[PDB]
Amino acid sequence: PAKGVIQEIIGVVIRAKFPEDEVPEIYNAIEIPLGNGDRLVCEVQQQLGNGVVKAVAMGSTDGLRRGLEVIDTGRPIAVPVGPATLGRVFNVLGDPIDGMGPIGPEVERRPIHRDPPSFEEQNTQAQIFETGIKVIDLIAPFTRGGKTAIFGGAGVGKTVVIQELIANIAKEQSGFSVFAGVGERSREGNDLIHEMKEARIDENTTVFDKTVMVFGQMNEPPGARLRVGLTALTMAEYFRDEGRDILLFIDNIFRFVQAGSEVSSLLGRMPSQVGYQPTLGTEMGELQERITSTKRGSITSMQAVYVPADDYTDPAPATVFSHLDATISLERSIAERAIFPAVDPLASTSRILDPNIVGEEHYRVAQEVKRVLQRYKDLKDIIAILGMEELSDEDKLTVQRARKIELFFSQPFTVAQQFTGRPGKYVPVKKTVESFARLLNGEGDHIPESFFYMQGDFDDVLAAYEASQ
Amino acid sequence: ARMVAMRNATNNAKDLVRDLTLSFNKARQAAITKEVSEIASGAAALTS
Amino acid sequence: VNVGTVIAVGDGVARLSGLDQVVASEIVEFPPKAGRNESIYGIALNLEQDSVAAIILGDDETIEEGDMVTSTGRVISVPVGQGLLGRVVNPLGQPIDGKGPIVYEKTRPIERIAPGVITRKSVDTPVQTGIIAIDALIPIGRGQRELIIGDRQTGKTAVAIDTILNQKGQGMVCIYVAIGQRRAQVAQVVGTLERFGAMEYTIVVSATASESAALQYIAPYAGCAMGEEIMENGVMLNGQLVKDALIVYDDLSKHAVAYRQVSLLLRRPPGREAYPGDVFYLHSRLLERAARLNEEYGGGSLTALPVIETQANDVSAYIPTNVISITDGQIYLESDLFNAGQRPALNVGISVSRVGGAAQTRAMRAVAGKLKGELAQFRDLAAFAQFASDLDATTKAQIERGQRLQELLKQPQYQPLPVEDQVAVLYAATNNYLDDVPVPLITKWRDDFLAFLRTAHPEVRKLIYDNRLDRKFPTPEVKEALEAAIKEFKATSNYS
Amino acid sequence: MLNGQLVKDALIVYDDLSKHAVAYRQVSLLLRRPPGREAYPGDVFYLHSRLLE
Ligand SMILES: Nc1ncnc2c1ncn2[C@@H]1O[C@H](COP(=O)(O)OP(=O)(O)OP(=O)(O)O)[C@@H](O)[C@H]1O
Numbered sequence A: 001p002a003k004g005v006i007q008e009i010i011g012v013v014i015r016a017k018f019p020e021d022e023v024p025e026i027y028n029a030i031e032i033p034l035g036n037g038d039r040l041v042c043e044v045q046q047q048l049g050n051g052v053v054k055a056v057a058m059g060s061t062d063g064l065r066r067g068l069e070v071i072d073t074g075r076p077i078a079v080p081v082g083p084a085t086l087g088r089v090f091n092v093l094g095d096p097i098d099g100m101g102p103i104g105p106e107v108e109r110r111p112i113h114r115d116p117p118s119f120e121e122q123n124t125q126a127q128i129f130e131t132g133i134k135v136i137d138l139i140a141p142f143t144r145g146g147k148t149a150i151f152g153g154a155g156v157g158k159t160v161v162i163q164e165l166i167a168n169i170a171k172e173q174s175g176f177s178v179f180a181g182v183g184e185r186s187r188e189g190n191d192l193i194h195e196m197k198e199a200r201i202d203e204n205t206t207v208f209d210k211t212v213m214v215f216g217q218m219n220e221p222p223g224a225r226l227r228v229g230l231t232a233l234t235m236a237e238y239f240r241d242e243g244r245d246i247l248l249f250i251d252n253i254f255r256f257v258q259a260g261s262e263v264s265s266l267l268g269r270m271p272s273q274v275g276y277q278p279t280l281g282t283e284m285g286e287l288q289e290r291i292t293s294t295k296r297g298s299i300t301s302m303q304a305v306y307v308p309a310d311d312y313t314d315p316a317p318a319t320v321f322s323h324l325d326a327t328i329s330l331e332r333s334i335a336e337r338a339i340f341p342a343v344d345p346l347a348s349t350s351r352i353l354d355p356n357i358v359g360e361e362h363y364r365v366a367q368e369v370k371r372v373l374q375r376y377k378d379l380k381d382i383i384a385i386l387g388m389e390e391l392s393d394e395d396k397l398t399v400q401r402a403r404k405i406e407l408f409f410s411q412p413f414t415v416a417q418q419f420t421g422r423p424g425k426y427v428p429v430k431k432t433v434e435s436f437a438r439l440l441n442g443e444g445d446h447i448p449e450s451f452f453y454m455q456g457d458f459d460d461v462l463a464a465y466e467a468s469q
Numbered sequence B: 001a002r003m004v005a006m007r008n009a010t011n012n013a014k015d016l017v018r019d020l021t022l023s024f025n026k027a028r029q030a031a032i033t034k035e036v037s038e039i040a041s042g043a044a045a046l047t048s
Numbered sequence C: 001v002n003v004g005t006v007i008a009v010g011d012g013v014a015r016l017s018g019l020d021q022v023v024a025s026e027i028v029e030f031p032p033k034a035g036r037n038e039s040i041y042g043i044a045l046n047l048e049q050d051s052v053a054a055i056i057l058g059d060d061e062t063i064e065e066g067d068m069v070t071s072t073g074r075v076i077s078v079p080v081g082q083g084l085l086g087r088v089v090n091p092l093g094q095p096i097d098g099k100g101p102i103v104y105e106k107t108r109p110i111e112r113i114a115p116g117v118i119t120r121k122s123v124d125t126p127v128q129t130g131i132i133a134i135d136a137l138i139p140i141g142r143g144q145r146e147l148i149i150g151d152r153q154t155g156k157t158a159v160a161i162d163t164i165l166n167q168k169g170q171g172m173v174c175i176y177v178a179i180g181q182r183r184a185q186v187a188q189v190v191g192t193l194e195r196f197g198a199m200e201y202t203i204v205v206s207a208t209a210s211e212s213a214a215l216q217y218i219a220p221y222a223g224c225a226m227g228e229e230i231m232e233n234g235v236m237l238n239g240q241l242v243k244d245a246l247i248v249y250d251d252l253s254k255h256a257v258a259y260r261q262v263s264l265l266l267r268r269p270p271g272r273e274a275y276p277g278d279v280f281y282l283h284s285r286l287l288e289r290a291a292r293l294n295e296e297y298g299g300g301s302l303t304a305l306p307v308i309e310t311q312a313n314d315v316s317a318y319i320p321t322n323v324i325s326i327t328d329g330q331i332y333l334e335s336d337l338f339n340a341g342q343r344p345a346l347n348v349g350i351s352v353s354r355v356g357g358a359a360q361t362r363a364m365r366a367v368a369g370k371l372k373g374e375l376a377q378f379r380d381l382a383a384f385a386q387f388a389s390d391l392d393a394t395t396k397a398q399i400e401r402g403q404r405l406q407e408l409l410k411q412p413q414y415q416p417l418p419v420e421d422q423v424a425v426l427y428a429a430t431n432n433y434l435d436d437v438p439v440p441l442i443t444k445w446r447d448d449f450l451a452f453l454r455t456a457h458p459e460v461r462k463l464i465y466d467n468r469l470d471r472k473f474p475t476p477e478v479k480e481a482l483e484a485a486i487k488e489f490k491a492t493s494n495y496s
Numbered sequence D: 001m002l003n004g005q006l007v008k009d010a011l012i013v014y015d016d017l018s019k020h021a022v023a024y025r026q027v028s029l030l031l032r033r034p035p036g037r038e039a040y041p042g043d044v045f046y047l048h049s050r051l052l053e
């Protein structure tokens, strides 16, 4: 239907002319036959004039000429939704890539471009979501049905924290999970995430058996990375709308943003700030507002956000920051100091860090830990050149407690046994609060700092110190 | 003791000066790159 | 219809009017004319209306407005196969070593999507670099992308060349894509490879800093296409079919610089640090093709060793962080350790290997866990190494042993060590047998010990190599044999 | 009318004029208006002042 002709091919952007009365819609999908029986499913973005449209390739577009025919499908990119998508690995277009057979035509296909839930649908109910990580469960607690993100640089442990979260919480879900590997690098993803999700057993069913996986990896051209997040959100919204709880892990939202930036550069838009698209905020709103949990069902989102260089003032993470219920900041300085759960407690916040929601003692302990660390950060310049000896006795005690707290936030992970030769350790939120309260009370002042490195609760530190004696 | 402590403080201050000079050079290069990129964007959007 | 004319020659881009029936990445020909005996090619990339912008893979002063151009009808590709071994080639596949034309039967297209996301398997086979520090602390498996990041003149190229040299009988096809390097440096590298006889399994793709901007941008992709040909099909090396390749993108920062100037001369909007917005996509699509395929898709692998040059040890720049976020692990080469005599200046504190720890010989990991732990203890005690014997509760002994291991990790250039020699030396060091050796004479001791293993007891080395894959390495037979060899060497020789 | 009295006092809180300026910059750049500093349009000060006066 509505057969047009390719006019221009600039990168992954294809400008195609169509008849005047049969111009494709704004987000319509158009297929280039490409020969060999396999199509290239471009997605329209703009209408330029007398049947002239601009589309994003969603594919290689590296060996196709001008003048090729383009068949307008008349509908946007439709991906399968339902129980048939559980235990399968999909593309940006919803085509399975695993060895299993294709999705049958009887399965409902939904467009990847849907309106976000309205204001009446929003669910503000918040409660603690225990993760087993001390720094996450204390400083920036997770919200069940709330949006949390793990910002970080390049060498910091973003994928390791995502893997540990999956290993800790995906065995007990009371629902389903969706993993959007947007620019995930395809080695630490399906080569590893899918392998470890088929090894974890939940009542004789693997975690992967109740997990949708959609992978717009780094090798893909910008269009696949630009729409794969929306594909995964469309697949998760079906389970959300029917009441099932959803655990959504989107890895490197910044890859989504970067793909959008490259497409906008090829689309001729005028750039903003450091080469970014003018429509950065609206694109971020379009993806992020569909992630929100509603009254029918809840999505507990855990996104990873790459930070270019180490610049947290970059427009992409800055736009991500305001779309979250919990923020975790990973710092290269902490990671280089071998505190590998390198969460910055002063730069990590959470909305449910309230004495009414999480508890009075939890709130008091977290705020006192942050206050001690802020005092340490203020005295860093004093300690750097004068040394510890010039500080007052209270300041010396505060700095020692802060160093012990910094070392104590480090925790051995089950998925990190190859790096640190220690077994994985799970610490409940109550044990985390009690251990940090005991550390702040004065217990452990006689213990040297090195016994707080890569331990569980305070009882593990005490046991190690008594073993050393 | 004061002599030794102040010698150590002077050495640490020199190291901090070196690190801050590296940071300042990075900041200056980034500022000039941002300025020329903004000027080129504002000029190429109205001429060609 | 496949013939066009140049209507403008600019900053490495020619506009090529009237070239219909050209695909989006053809290699246009520019057939030879008067004053130019050899054809120079170009990539048609901006296929706009009645204009086909093409970047020129060569000097742009040779072509003229009004020149005639023919369309070859194929996406840009490089010759691949057995005939590329032993040849220094242009990123177009043309030979530059003067040994004659390249014989080949197939051309693999550069600029292709990675083998896939299903089509991969976790690394299990190790890559023996021959460096004690790297093979012990930063294991590299076949199919792993291990970045080599450091400052200028820190031994990154030396590390890559030692890694290439060690893959002699290992069934590995090595590729060295020097991007932006000086022609003198590439000539020295090729002379070194020829000196040790590595070139009979090595391909060199040379894109000199003097060469065009379009070159040094397709050079890593040409090398990766050759490596993918090795991965998918394999070649006959040493009489056996090998499907394992190891590629070294020497100085990918210069590759990023070349792509930045290509983009800026194309009037593309700059991003961070004036680089184009798709430089991450550049390096990601380059490195994602280095994979470890499962047995369904061949079982071959392409190890990648990208090289990144930093400025004043700035890990947190744009391109270094891009490549770190793409690659698996990092091998960081300090300038301070390099200038202090630790020539394999491996920053053990920050150099990691996300995968390849499982892709290590069990002997090496069994004898290297203790080495890594004691190096961590030595680094912890480094801040406490300023007290006049105020700490002595085995802390002085721990510092002495850490200095011993650090001196042991010091390795001369162009002398790779076999896995059996590495594990024997590491077992000797980790079983309290070098504690009577003074610090300055450890390395000589190692050399002498290796000689004692090479001449007196080759059967000990053979026994060590035979049971390197056992679940527990120090089996009583090999334990007794290696203990006897170490004690005999300590007896017949001096302390060193 | 409010609680039985005619209130003529109002308190307006623009919770993000940085986001408002970002939205206006997106509008201006999509309209291909000439950029200013940080890609913001020239009349971005005239915008907020017109709102805040
Ligand atoms: N293990 C080593 N033992 C002795 N000398 C070494 C070793 N590694 C490197 N060198 C020496 O260090 C010098 C620089 O090494 P190399 O050229 O490999 O470094 P690079 O980081 O690639 O430098 P460039 O920035 O010039 O490319 C050479 O003189 C080389 O011989």
Ligand SMILES: Nc1ncnc2c1ncn2[C@@H]1O[C@H](COP(=O)(O)OP(=O)(O)O)[C@@H](O)[C@H]1O
Pocket: A152, A153, A154, A155, A156, A157, A158, A159, A160, A161, A188, A340, A341, A411, A412, A413, A416, A419, A420, C324, C325, C329, C352, C353, C354
């Ligand atoms: N919890 C941890 N324990 C030990 N090492 C860790 C941990 N988290 C991260 N690392 C280190 O970080 C590296 C993985 O970083 P990764 O999270 O993959 O980076 P990215 O942010 O690009 O995903 C590994 O090499 C590992 O050494």
Ligand SMILES: [Mg+2]
Pocket: A158, A159, A184, A188
């Ligand atoms: Mg990651």
Ligand SMILES: [Mg+2]
Pocket: C156, C157, C158
């Ligand atoms: Mg070099």
